[PDB]
Amino acid sequence: DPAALERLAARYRRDGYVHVPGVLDAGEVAEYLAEARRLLAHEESVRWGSGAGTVMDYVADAQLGSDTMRRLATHPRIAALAEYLAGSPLRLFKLEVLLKENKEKDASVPTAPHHDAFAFPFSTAGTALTAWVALVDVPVERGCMTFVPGSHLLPDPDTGDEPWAGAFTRPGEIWMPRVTVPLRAGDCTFHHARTVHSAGANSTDEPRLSTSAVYMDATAAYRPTGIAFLDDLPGTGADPLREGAPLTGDRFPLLRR
Ligand SMILES: COC(=O)[C@@H]1c2cc3c(c(O)c2[C@@H](O[C@H]2C[C@H](O)[C@@H](O)[C@H](C)O2)C[C@]1(C)O)C(=O)c1c(O)cc2c(c1C3=O)O[C@H]1C[C@H](N(C)C)[C@H](O)[C@]2(C)O1
Ligand code: NI
Numbered sequence: 001d002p003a004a005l006e007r008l009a010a011r012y013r014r015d016g017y018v019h020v021p022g023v024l025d026a027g028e029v030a031e032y033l034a035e036a037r038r039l040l041a042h043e044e045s046v047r048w049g050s051g052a053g054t055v056m057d058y059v060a061d062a063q064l065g066s067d068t069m070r071r072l073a074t075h076p077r078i079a080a081l082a083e084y085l086a087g088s089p090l091r092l093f094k095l096e097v098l099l100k101e102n103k104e105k106d107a108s109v110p111t112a113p114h115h116d117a118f119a120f121p122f123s124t125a126g127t128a129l130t131a132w133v134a135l136v137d138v139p140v141e142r143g144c145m146t147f148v149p150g151s152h153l154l155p156d157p158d159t160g161d162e163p164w165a166g167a168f169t170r171p172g173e174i175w176m177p178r179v180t181v182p183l184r185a186g187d188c189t190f191h192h193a194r195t196v197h198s199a200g201a202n203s204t205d206e207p208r209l210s211t212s213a214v215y216m217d218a219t220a221a222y223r224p225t226g227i228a229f230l231d232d233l234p235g236t237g238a239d240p241l242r243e244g245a246p247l248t249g250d251r252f253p254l255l256r257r
Contacts, residue, residue, distance in 0.1 A: 005081075005084060008020070008081075008084075008085070009084060009085050009087075012085045012190065012192070014149070014150070015147070015149035015150065015179075015195075016147070016148075016149060016150065016151060016152030016153070016191060016192040016194065016195035017147045017149070017179075017181075017189055017190065017191035017192065017195050017197070018085070018189065018190050018191075019181055019183070019187065019188075019189050020081065020187065020188050020189070020190070021184065021187050022184075022186055022187060023075075023077055023078060023081070023133065023186060023187065023188040024075070024077075024133065024186035024188075025186065026186065028186065029135060029185050029186045031068070032068070032069075032072050032133075032135055032211070033135040033136065033185075033209060035066065035068045035069060036097045036135055036209050036211065037209070039059045039062055039065070039066060039069070039097055040057070040059060040097065040099055043059050043062075043065060044059075045057040045058060045059050045099070046058055046059075046060050050109075052109050053106055053107050053108065053109040054100075054103075054106050054107075054108060054109065055100075055109055055110070055111055055112075056098055056099055056100050056111065057099040057101075058096050058097060058098045058099060059096060059097040060094070060096060060234075061094055061095070061096070061233075061234050061235070062095050062096055062097045062211075063092070063094070063095040064234060064235050069095055069097065069211070070095075072095065072133070072211060072213075073092050073095040073211075073213050074092060074253060074255065078131055078133070078188065078213075079255040079256065080256075081190065082129060082131060082190065082215045082255060083255055083256060085129065085190055086127070086129050086215065086217075088217055088218065089217075089218040089254070089255070089256060090129075090215045090216060090217060090218055090254075090255045090256075091215065091216050091217070091218050091220065091247065091248075091252045091253060091254055091255060092213065092214075092215060092216075092252060092253050092255065093120065093122065093128070093214040093215065093216045093220075093247070093252060094213070094214050095211055095212070095213040095214075096211065096212045096213075097209075097210075097211055098208070098209070098210045098211065098212055099207060099208065099209060100142075100143045100199075100201070100202040100207065100208035101202055101207040101208065102202060102203075102204075102205065107201075108143065108201045108202040108203070108208075109201050110143070110198065110199060110200050110201040111143075111145075111198055111199035111200075112167070112198060113146075113148075113167035113168060113196055113197065113198035114164045114165070114167050114196070114197070114198070115156075115157060115164055115165070115166050115167050115194065115196055116128075116130060116164060116193050116197075116214075117156070117163075117193035117194050118156070118159070118163040118164075118225065119163040119164040119225060119227075119230055120193065120214060120216070120225075120230075121222060121223055121224055121225050121230055121231050121233070122216055122220040122221060122222060122223050122247060123217075123220050123221045123222075123223050123244075124216055124217040124219075124220045125193060125216075125223065126156075126193060126194065127192070127193060127217065128192075128193040128214060128215065128216050128217075129190055129191065129192055129193065129214075129215050130190070130191050130193070130212060130213065130214050130215070131188055131189070131190050131211075131212070131213045131215065132145065132188060132189045132190075132191070132210055132211070132212050132213075133186075133187075133188040133210060133211045133212075133213070134183040134184065134185050134186065134187050134188065134209075134210050135185060135186075135209040135210055135211065136185050136206070136207070136208065136209050136210075137183075137184055137185050138182060138183045138184075138185075138208055138210070139182045140180060140182050140200065141200070141202075141203050141204050142200075142202050142203075142204045142206065142208050143199050143200045143201055143202040143203075143208045144180065144181055144182040144183055144199065144200065145180075145181055145189065145197055145198065145199045146178050146179065146180045146181070146197060146198045146199065146200070147178070147179050147181065147189075147191060147195055147196070147197045148173075148176050148177075148178050148179070148195065148196040148197065149176075149177070149178075149179055149195075150176060151173070151176060151194070151195055151196040152192040152193075152194040152195040152196075153194075154170050154173065154194075155170065156194070157169050157170060162227075163225045163226070163227065163230070167196050167198075168196070173196075180200075215255065216247070216252075218254060218255075219246070220246075220247050220252075221244050221245060221246050221247060222241045222242065222243055222244065222245040222246075222247060223243060223244075224243060235251055236251060
């Protein structure tokens with residue numbers, strides 16, 4: 001529906017995020033859920049974490065190892081929505097498989113508020129957009145996200161040292177309302193790179209399973225952040241990438257054809 005799709009982009013532009021129910025059908029959920037699990041048991045995961053505990057375990061660049069995940073990253077419907085909201089043609093940068101759970105030593109902790117934007121190592125990071133797809137029910141207590149509507153319109157935070165930092169540092173920012181967005185399996189959220197957002201801890205004995213896909217402007221180019229683990233991109237060849245190099249080909253596939 002054209003008119004409906006436009007109401008959606010209005011919401012995205014106003015708020016810097018939007019919630020889309022049922023972006024995947026039931027079977028598609030089961031398909032992608034089963035594959036997420038498999039990757040989390042077989043592949044190597046990365047602990048995003050601290051002495052407080054595990055923020056999450058995740059599988060980096062998961063679309064490279066797995067055709068299945070590549071299909072989800074490039075799912076026709078998610079892609080079409082992504083391009084419409086973004087306003088221009090896009091490419092996939094990365095897809096990650098995400099896990100919040102409670103282990104015996106290692107309790108699950110929240111995802112602190114943050115600002116994804118200049119932690120993306122590409123020229124157009126400022127206007128990037130991220131799709132987050134629930135593969136299981138994610139009510140509040142299981143660690144759904146919270147977004148600050150409007151926050152994508154604020155000036156960026158002081159370019160200090162950690163490219164994700166600066167959430168809740170701008171004048172009047174702490175007085176803005178916040179929206180907590182529980183999701184049903186197969187639901188997704190889109191959010192703008194500059195939108196401030198956070199997530200709860202998983203305080204339930206059932207794991208929180210989701211994918212997060214970062215889409216980027218089709219003409220984007222490499223822009224090191226300085227943080228080595230953000231800058232070092234697998235499946236790009238032997239030597240590292242020089243600044244200003246274009247991100248293209250199957251490695252960073254176009255969304256539309
Ligand atoms: C240098 O900081 C660290 O060693 C930790 C850390 C790490 C991250 C981040 C961190 O905040 C931290 C650090 O942030 C601290 C900040 C404070 O000290 C406190 O809120 C708590 C102790 O967590 C912890 C640690 C050991 O320093 C991020 O915030 C982060 C992020 O916001 C976004 C990403 C981040 C991060 C972080 O990796 O990494 C990748 C993967 C992500 N995926 C899994 C959704 C994202 O796409 C993205 C862009 O890419
Ligand atoms: Ni984020």
